[PDB]
Design a protein around this nucleic acid. Structure first.
Ligand SMILES: Cc1cn([C@H]2C[C@H](O)[C@@H](COP(=O)(O)OP(=O)(O)[C@@H](C)P(=O)(O)O)O2)c(=O)[nH]c1=O
Ligand SMILES: [Cl-]
Ligand SMILES: [Cl-]
Ligand SMILES: [Cl-]
Ligand SMILES: [Mg+2]
Ligand code: NA
Ligand code: NA
Length: 326
DNA sequence: CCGACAGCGCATCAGC
DNA sequence: GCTGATGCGC
DNA sequence: GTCGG
């Protein structure tokens, strides 16, 4: 990509802050700057030039100058020389392993992919699966595969009940050419915002997808959220597709638009939009938009008929999913 | 010169 | 077992 | 780390 050098650096800095420092605002600052730069259709040649974009302040500006001049960051070289931090950065790439589990493992002398394999009994279920599929989960899903996955999931939910609506969100809905996981948003008139007539709903869908061996593994399971692992069927005599992460959300019909807004993101876009909502006197989550009080008490949910209704409330021009890719 | 920084679902852990 | 906190992930 | 007040 055009400014890939700069964006890789920022991302590497962001990972350090998330995985080691646990400084979540520095994480998002680097992450935000990285995304506005990656969207900038011009090759940044200086920090000063960069400083003109939003999210880019004084310190990223300086780091962009150092990187452009040397092809490196002293900060990043020292991190790379730090053995404990480096071990932590690697282990956190396994699904289910965050900074806390990474540090526990390192002190137990568990610091490599093979170390994990030799000590599987020290891993919880999520981490076992994260380890089992570690290679697969380093691989992105081509949009074309997302389409076949879409096709399977949308038909299966109709098979369990033709009144089900399944919407594929996340990066796919923003039009991305490849996606990290599959995010599926699900409704049914039986689950509405105040009375759930029939629970079990999410379980039936999961049950069917397991039955046809699309869903292969379970990470988490509740009334509104399933997290797991799925896989496209391969044709005769060929390499299986990689296993993929899937997240399915069951949301009331009356909350569908807040749900699809949330699940489409992106995460940086959601934080920006939600911050602006706060500054305009509202609060947005995946279910509702609510008025805010003088003392911060949340009011009752506002009527929502479309995604654009939510943008209107906080006085934003509607933005297509394709331009929410912050 | 500093405080704010989005919001939530589910699994596990610590202490009882 | 429960409460409440942490952990990890959308 | 950045941004707004
Ligand atoms: C992580 C996160 C997510 N989301 C919302 C918004 C977010 O879009 C949605 C899906 O989360 P994905 O982690 O799947 O993000 P994605 O856009 O699908 C993309 C990075 P890919 O999966 O192709 O790698 O959940 C948030 O609102 N806040 C968050 O912190
Ligand atoms: Cl921070
Ligand atoms: Cl470097
Ligand atoms: Cl709510
Ligand atoms: Mg996704
Ligand atoms: Na700026
Ligand atoms: Na991880």
């Amino acid at each position: 990509t055009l400014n890939g050098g700069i964006t890789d650096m920022l991302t590497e800095l962001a990972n350090f802050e998330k995985n080691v420092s646990q400084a979540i605002h520095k994480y998002n600052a680097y992450r935000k700057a990285a995304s506005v730069i990656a969207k900038y259709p011009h090759k940044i040649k200086s920090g000063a030039e960069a400083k003109k974009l939003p999210g880019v302040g004084t310190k990223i500006l300086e780091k962009i100058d150092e990187f452009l001049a040397t092809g490196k960051l002293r900060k990043l070289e020292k991190i790379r020389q730090d053995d404990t931090s480096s071990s932590i950065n690697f282990l956190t790439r396994v699904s289910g392993i965050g900074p806390s589990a990474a540090r526990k493992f390192v002190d137990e002398g568990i610091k490599t992919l093979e170390d994990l394999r030799k000590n599987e009994d020290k891993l919880n279920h999520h981490q076992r699966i994260g380890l089992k599929y570690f290679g697969d989960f380093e691989k992105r899903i081509p949009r074309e595969e997302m389409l076949q996955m879409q096709d399977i999931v949308l038909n299966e939910v109709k098979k369990v009940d033709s009144e089900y609506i399944a919407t594929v969100c996340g990066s796919f809905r923003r039009g991305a050419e490849s996606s990290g996981d599959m995010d599926v948003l699900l409704t049914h008139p039986s689950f509405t915002s105040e009375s759930t007539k029939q629970p079990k709903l999410l379980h039936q869908v999961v049950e069917q997808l397991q039955k046809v061996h699309f869903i292969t593994d379970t990470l988490s399971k509740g009334e509104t959220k399933f997290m797991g692992v799925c896989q496209l069927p391969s044709k005769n005599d060929e390499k299986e597709y990689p296993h993929r992460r899937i997240d399915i959300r069951l949301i009331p019909k009356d909350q569908y638009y807040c749900g699809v807004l949330y699940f489409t993101g992106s995460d940086i876009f959601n934080k920006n939009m939600r911050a602006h909502a706060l500054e305009k006197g509202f609060t947005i989550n995946e279910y509702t938009i609510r008025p805010l009080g003088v003392t911060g008490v949340a009011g009752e949910p506002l009527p929502v008929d479309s995604e654009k209704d939510i943008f209107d409330y906080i006085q934003w021009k509607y933005r297509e999913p394709k331009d929410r890719s912050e």
